[PDB]
Every structure is written in C-alpha cells, then in structure tokens.
Design a protein around this ligand. Structure first.
Ligand SMILES: N=C(N)c1cc(-c2ccccc2)c(CNC(=O)c2ccc3c(c2)CCO3)s1
Ligand SMILES: N=C(N)c1cc(-c2ccccc2)c(CNC(=O)c2ccc3c(c2)CCO3)s1
Ligand SMILES: N=C(N)c1cc(-c2ccccc2)c(CNC(=O)c2ccc3c(c2)CCO3)s1
Ligand SMILES: N=C(N)c1cc(-c2ccccc2)c(CNC(=O)c2ccc3c(c2)CCO3)s1
Ligand SMILES: N=C(N)c1cc(-c2ccccc2)c(CNC(=O)c2ccc3c(c2)CCO3)s1
Ligand SMILES: N=C(N)c1cc(-c2ccccc2)c(CNC(=O)c2ccc3c(c2)CCO3)s1
Ligand SMILES: [Mg+2]
Ligand SMILES: [Mg+2]
Lengths: 227, 6, 227, 6
C-alpha cells in the first residue's frame, strides 16, 4: 500500500478533509490505508469507508449505464471498448472493497454492530458486480448470502429502527427487485421493514427519530414504485 | 430505477 | 503517450462518449491523445478539449479552495500536506495543457479563429496557476500577455458578438478583477464588451443571438457584483 | 467570486 508510510490518525484526518473537498477517490484511498493498518474501524470510520467507496463506484455505475444504453441502441468497436474499460475499472473497485472485507474486516468484527455493517457492504459490492455480470449466477448467490447473514444478526441484535438495520433491509430489497428477479420478496421485505420501524418510533429521541424516518422515506418511495 | 441507501 | 496506439477518430469518438458519461478525466486523456497526433483540431474538437480540462481543473480548484480555507482557519501537518498534494496535481494538469498549447497547437493554428481559441486557453491555465502561486508575478504576466494577444487578434478578425471573443473578454476581465488587482480594468473591459455586443445583436440569427446573449449574461452578473 | 465562462 502506498499509504503504508502514513500514520493511521493522519489517514483518517485526510479522509475527512477529502470528503469536505469532494475528492472521493482520495477519500477511498485514505480509508483503504486506514483499514490496512489492521485495527478496528469505529462507527464514524466505517461510515467514512462506506461513503468514500459508494461515491467512487457510484460514478462508475452511472457512467457504465450511460455507455451500456448507447451500446444497446447501436445494436465500430469504440462504444463496446470504452464500456468494457469502465466495467473493468468498476469491477476492480468492487474487488478491492470485497478484499478489505474478507482480509480481515469481517472476521475481526467482534460485535454485531460492526459485523452487520461489513456484511451489508459485502452484499452491496457483490450486487454492484452483479449489475455488470453475465457467473452472474454465482455473484447473485454471494450477494444474497451476505445480505441474509446480516439480516439474521440484525434481527437478533438491533432494534427495528436502527439505521444500519434499516439501510440493510432497504438495499436487500433493491437486490431482490433489480437483480434477483424477486419483486414479491422485495415488496414483502420493504413493507415488513417499514411497518416494524413505524411501530418502534415511539421509543426514540428526536434525533434517532430523524435517522430512522429518513431511511423509511426510501422504503416508501420504492413501495410506491413497486405497487 | 429503485432507490438504495442514499 | 498511452493513447499513441489509438486511432485519432477513435480518440475523438471516445472523448464524446466520456463527456456523455461525465468521465472528464478520461475525456481529457482522450483529447490529449488526439492533440498529440499532430493534426488540426476542428471547432468541435477544440470545444471538447476545453470542456474536458475545464472540468478536471474545476474539481481541483474547488477542492483546493476548500482545503485552503480550512488551512487558513487552523492559523498537525495534515491539512497543509493534503492542500499541497491537491495543489501539485492541479499544477500538473495546468502544465500539461500549457504544454499541448506550446507544442504545438498555437504555432500550428493557421487562422485567427483557432489561434484566438488557444491563446484564450493559455491565459486561462496561467490564471489557474496564478490562483495557487506565491513567481506569482511571472505567471500573472504570462497570463496577461496571452489574453492580450488573443484580444488584439479577436478585435481585428471577429465580430463583437462572436462567442469565443466574448468568452475571452469575460475571462480576461475575471483575471483583472480576481488575480491582477485591477478591478477598474475588469469593469472597463466587461462594460465595453457587453455594450459592443449589444449594439451588434441586430446582425444575428436566432441561434447566434442565443450564443451571444448567454455570455452577455455572465458579463452582466459580474458587473452587477463589481459596481 | 467572479464568474468565468461557464
Ligand atoms: N463523515 C461522514 N460522512 C459521517 C460521519 C458519521 C459519524 C460521525 C460521528 C460518529 C458516528 C458517525 C456519519 C453517521 N452516518 C450518517 O449520519 C448517515 C446518514 C444517512 C445516510 C448515511 C449515513 C448513509 C447514506 O444514508 S456519516
Ligand atoms: N445505535 C445507533 N442507533 C447509532 C449509534 C451511533 C454512534 C455510535 C458511536 C458514536 C457515535 C454515534 C450512530 C451514528 N449514526 C450512524 O452511524 C448513521 C445514522 C444514520 C444512517 C446511517 C448511519 C446509515 C443510514 O442512515 S447511530
Ligand atoms: N402487493 C402489496 N403488498 C400491496 C398491494 C397494494 C394495493 C392493494 C389493493 C389496491 C391498491 C393497492 C398496496 C397499497 N400500497 C401500500 O400499502 C403501501 C403500504 C405501505 C407503505 C407504502 C405503500 C410506503 C411505506 O409503507 S401494497
Ligand atoms: N461536445 C461539446 N461540449 C460541444 C460541441 C460543440 C460543437 C459541436 C459541433 C460543431 C461545433 C461545435 C460545442 C460548441 N460550443 C458550445 O456550444 C458552448 C456553449 C456555451 C459555452 C461553451 C461552449 C463553453 C462554456 O460556455 S460544445
Ligand atoms: N463563428 C461563429 N459564431 C461560430 C461558428 C461555429 C461552428 C464552426 C464550425 C462548425 C460548426 C459550428 C460555432 C459553434 N459554436 C461554438 O463553438 C460556441 C458556441 C457558444 C459558446 C462557445 C462556443 C464558447 C462560449 O459560448 S460558433
Ligand atoms: N464604475 C462603473 N462603470 C459604473 C458605475 C455605475 C453607477 C453610477 C452611479 C450610481 C450607481 C451606479 C454603474 C451602473 N451599473 C451599470 O451601468 C451596469 C451597466 C451595464 C451593464 C451592467 C450593469 C450589466 C451588463 O451591462 S456602472
Ligand atoms: Mg476486532
Ligand atoms: Mg494548421
């Protein structure tokens, strides 16, 4: 790692600066360096890691979708070639994230909060691989298995309003609808998740209430599209 | 397209 | 150049795809490859080159401004170090563009339209260097000299509504106000440019009228701020 | 800040 010579605390500080500067590639590199130090990531640091790679892969996914749409309408080699270039770059980022999770974030995640967070990430980055795969079958199964393990732990160890649990269920429901050809599973998961969170809002402070209802909005938006 | 965590 | 093995036509096509995909770093790399083939850039291709590098350096400038503001308020080494990293990357992009212009876009620009376009670019990229310089004196003089040569040619060879001429005068006026501590020069240039364009709108088609009045809006916005 | 060509 080219970040191996930098102190962990300096990598975290620079990741926070990169976020403020909207330099998400730098942010991701700094957070990869921090992970590779081999110590726990705190809740804040896990959020930094996730935000950084979500923004990097998000731009790649948006580009890939533009190019894939152009390639489809065209049906010279240039559109295919450039789509393949972006696709390879996207796969490389996903492989990098999955490698951090497998060596050794997940096994070293010594409580439910941290293990669920990383297993949700594992589902997400296999899902992004599935979006461009054609082999696609294996990736889909890996994403479902990671999401489901995360769900099982989260249902045992977190309340139904916990925002990590809510965002996990939201993204698993998107997986079912958009990737796995399981729209009924998507609807069932989003609806039960929404309803069980609603019935638990009375237990929350004003600030936690805001956290939970933000994700609940996204569940509602999908259910409105899907039904 | 469906909306993921954002 | 890593683009030396790609056909010129394929580089131009991929630059257009990269623009649609909002992949501006890729777009700039493709257009650098096309320039280095050693042939003319058409009006469309000059616009592609300019859009690509404007977006790349634009993100760098925005990041540098965020970090410089944080560094100023702080007055460990981390903010300075990271600001310096972004600054060096920004200078490298500007040096790359200035190198394309000097070897050999400007000398090979065999008419006024193309020479003015490239000299405007030369002023712009020296101006971006000046924003981060402290030596700053030399850069300021280089920017002013390029802009002024472009102005002299444009006044002799283009009508007052030509959008390249208008955008040149706009950016030279920003140079005067923000870089050269010459706010009166900025006001004088923006006002004469606006007034002379206005008096020439009657000569234009609906489409050229739209081109010119768009830049005239930016002249107006600055004059409203400056007076 | 002043506005350049955009
Ligand atoms: N520097 C950052 N970006 C963050 C820092 C922290 C933090 C700070 C101190 C202590 C613990 C955590 C965050 C907490 N996470 C959110 O607030 C959040 C809200 C909505 C949402 C997401 C995240 C994901 C998409 O939808 S984010
Ligand atoms: N046990 C809880 N309920 C929380 C505990 C903490 C925490 C832990 C240690 C230190 C400081 C704060 C939270 C911080 N908040 C988030 O991480 C967060 C918020 C909104 C959100 C997401 C994440 C993703 C989707 O939207 S939440
Ligand atoms: N296949 C299903 N399960 C559904 C079928 C219908 C339906 C039935 C008969 C007539 C018209 C529609 C549903 C109605 N829509 C919702 O109930 C809805 C519910 C909860 C919710 C949101 C939207 C957002 C957040 O929480 S849902
Ligand atoms: N692919 C692109 N991006 C472009 C392609 C062409 C083109 C196409 C065919 C023939 C000739 C030129 C453009 C012409 N230039 C503008 O229309 C323009 C308008 C406003 C403005 C700027 C530029 C700079 C900032 O303010 S841009
Ligand atoms: N002689 C003229 N008036 C023009 C001729 C052409 C052209 C030349 C060859 C082929 C097709 C078209 C133009 C294309 N348009 C631009 O390049 C353009 C438009 C708006 C704008 C900028 C640039 C920068 C600021 O805002 S303009
Ligand atoms: N130092 C100068 N030159 C100016 C001084 C004053 C002034 C004088 C007395 C009282 C109040 C203001 C000016 C008024 N503002 C404009 O005239 C203005 C003109 C043209 C124009 C735009 C704005 C936008 C596009 O074109 S300009
Ligand atoms: Mg541990
Ligand atoms: Mg020539």
């Amino acid at each position: 790692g080219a970040m191996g010579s930098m102190e962990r605390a300096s990598l975290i500080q620079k990741a926070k600066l990169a976020e403020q500067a909207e330099r998400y590639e730098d942010m991701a590199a700094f957070m990869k360096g921090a992970v590779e130090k081999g110590e726990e990531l705190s809740c804040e640091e896990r959020n930094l890691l996730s935000v950084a790679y979500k923004n990097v892969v998000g731009g790649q996914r948006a580009a890939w979708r533009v190019l894939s749409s152009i390639e489809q309408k065209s049906n010279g080699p240039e559109v295919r070639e450039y789509r393949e270039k972006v696709e390879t770059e996207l796969q490389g980022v996903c492989d990098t994230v999955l490698g951090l999770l497998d060596s050794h974030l997940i096994k070293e995640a010594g409580d439910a909060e941290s293990r669920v967070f990383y297993l949700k990430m594992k589902g997400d980055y296999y899902r992004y691989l599935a979006e461009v795969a054609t082999d696609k079958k294996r990736i889909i199964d890996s994403a479902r298995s990671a999401y489901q393990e995360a769900m099982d732990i989260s249902k045992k160890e977190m309340p139904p309003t916990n925002p990590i649990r809510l965002g996990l269920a939201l993204n698993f429901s998107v997986f079912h609808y958009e990737i796995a050809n399981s729209p009924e599973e998507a609807i069932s998961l989003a609806k039960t998740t929404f309803d069980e969170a609603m019935a638990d809002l009375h237990t929350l402070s004003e600030d936690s209430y805001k956290d939970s209802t933000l994700i609940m909005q996204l569940l509602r938006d999908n259910l409105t599209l899907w039904t | 397209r469906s909306l993921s965590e954002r």
